[PDB]
Amino acid sequence: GSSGSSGLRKQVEELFERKYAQAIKAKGPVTIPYPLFQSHVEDLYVEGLPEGIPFRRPSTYGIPRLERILLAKERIRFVIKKHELLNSTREDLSGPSSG
Numbered sequence: 001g002s003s004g005s006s007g008l009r010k011q012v013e014e015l016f017e018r019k020y021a022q023a024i025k026a027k028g029p030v031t032i033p034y035p036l037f038q039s040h041v042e043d044l045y046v047e048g049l050p051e052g053i054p055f056r057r058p059s060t061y062g063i064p065r066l067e068r069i070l071l072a073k074e075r076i077r078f079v080i081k082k083h084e085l086l087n088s089t090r091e092d093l094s095g096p097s098s099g
Contacts, residue, residue, distance in 0.1 A: 008066035012058035043082035048075030
């Protein structure tokens, strides 16, 4: 039972952020606001997703569900209609360093 080194979730986790970061040309690790997006799904929403797989924490999706998301990565896309909507919320991350 060894996990960590390369994992679907991680793959998606990095992907999700990646796409998002791309939408903001971010060469760094960014966080995806589930609320800001949930409260504003008419502005902030993920696209290119496969069928039967919405835009939610990849820490829930099934092993097979993730794979697809990775297979749709080519299509996957993050539309940031409202940018400001993002800004303002708490500011400052503060925590450990991941890379």
